[PDB]
């Protein structure tokens, strides 16, 4: 019932060194990898016990073939991109497709390509058109905007199938995805400086702050990033730094619960 999201990402790499696969594609529900394909295995496979257990061998067989297809297409598009740009070394092409389901039930959808980690092509499903960065992209958008059926399939998948799949996966992985693990919140000290630190919580979306003697908010608050602890939980911290003439307090919010702490 919180904002969730489905995303499938493709990555192609020309002239890759011994290790790097020429093509990798990966599926994700809110940062939980669910599916995987690469150029060595040439196989789509589950990246979660709950995906594996709940989909017949056909889904994987069927989508493996579809991804073998994309492999091939990216290999080719890469060479054409080189030929047009007069390129030379290992380059990257990438595509991201996906949808988001908000808590309020409304939806978003996204489809984008990138050459060398920079926006190349952005799809717009309300106007059935691509937007391109330079003529190279424009030229390849032109051909694409010719095929009307492809334009429409995308709108559909994004607006309809992507969500249907999200909903399924959410259910399929309920125990791990729709779970709530609250944080350990603590305060440590260290010019004298204090740190509100929280760890071992899920989901990762968390909000933290400091309130001046409960009244206002400290303007000057260094925020630690929210990082993965290793086990499926996340950890994060927030710091601030005159004999403390006004005693301070930490205010945190996770999964609907506003938490507070004094010193």
């Amino acid at each position: 019932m919180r904002t969730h999201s489905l995303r499938y990402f493709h990555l192609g790499v020309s002239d890759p060194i011994h290790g790097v696969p020429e093509f990798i594609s990966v599926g994700y529900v809110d940062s939980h990898p669910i599916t995987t394909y690469d150029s060595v295995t040439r196989q789509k496979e589950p990246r979660a016990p709950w995906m594996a257990e709940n989909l017949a061998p056909d889904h994987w067989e069927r989508y493996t073939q579809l991804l073998r297809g994309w492999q091939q297409m990216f290999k080719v598009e890469l060479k054409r991109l080189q030929r047009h740009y007069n390129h030379s070394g290992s380059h990257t092409y990438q595509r991201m497709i996906g949808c988001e389901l908000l808590e309020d039930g409304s939806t978003t959808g996204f489809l984008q390509y990138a050459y060398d980690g920079q926006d190349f092509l952005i799809f717009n499903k309300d106007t059935l058109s691509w937007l391109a960065v330079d003529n190279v992209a424009h030229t390849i958008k032109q051909a694409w905007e010719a095929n009307q059926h492809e334009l429409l399939y995308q709108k559909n998948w994004l607006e309809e199938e992507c969500i249907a799949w999200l909903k399924r996966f959410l259910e399929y992985g309920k125990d791990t995805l729709q779970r709530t693990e609250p944080p350990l919140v603590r305060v440590n000290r260290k010019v004298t400086a204090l740190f509100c630190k929280a760890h071992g919580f899920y989901p990762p979306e968390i909000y933290m702050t400091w309130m001046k003697n409960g009244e206002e908010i400290v303007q000057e608050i260094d925020y630690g990033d929210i990082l993965p602890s290793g086990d499926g939980t996340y950890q994060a911290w927030a710091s601030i730094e005159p004999q403390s003439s006004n005693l301070y307090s930490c205010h945190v919010e996770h999964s609907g619960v506003h938490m507070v702490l004094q010193v």
Partner: T-cell receptor
Amino acid sequence: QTVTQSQPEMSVQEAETVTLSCTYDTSESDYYLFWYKQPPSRQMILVIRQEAYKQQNATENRFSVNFQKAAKSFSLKISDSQLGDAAMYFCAYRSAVNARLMFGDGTQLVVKP
Amino acid sequence: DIYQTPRYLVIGTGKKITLECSQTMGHDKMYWYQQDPGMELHLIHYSYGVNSTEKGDLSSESTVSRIRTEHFPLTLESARPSHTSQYLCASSEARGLAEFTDTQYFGPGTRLTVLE
């Protein structure tokens, strides 16, 4: 993953409408539906195309379809039959993610003048 | 539109057969089906573009090659009676997605008969 055309043979008078009947079985939601005709030439010829994401039933002049999605029914309607219409007609389903065009067993249409 | 040679071929058992299929619509996706008397059409080979050659529902001792866009030949090394069937090449217009949002157009087919 399956198409059924139960009517092995079928007949129509010149200038009459006839309905060829077909059901498919699937679980996919994103899919593609076709009719093809195979005159004794043994050449497959596309008759019409319907996408599952469209309500309005396709119409190619004299040819049209009754797409009852929920019934998984896909009938070809031939108005104003002509002698030329004579051929084997085939119902076909294709997933948006697999290439095999799945074919019905085929209904042979004979036109009486 | 799309061409297929031969349209009829009678041949002895165990000889090398090459069915040609060519197309000039700029179609990257190409297909090969097989229709034995009665039995329904079976995708035996397909391709997403140049140097793609993938297998299909039915399993086959034929082989395909896709050195270039226009041609998708099918080869049969030791030809045997069971191979006797109608082989229909085909091609489709999807180019910007791997997915099959298109309509497949068939060529005229090759009536093969292999005899002992």
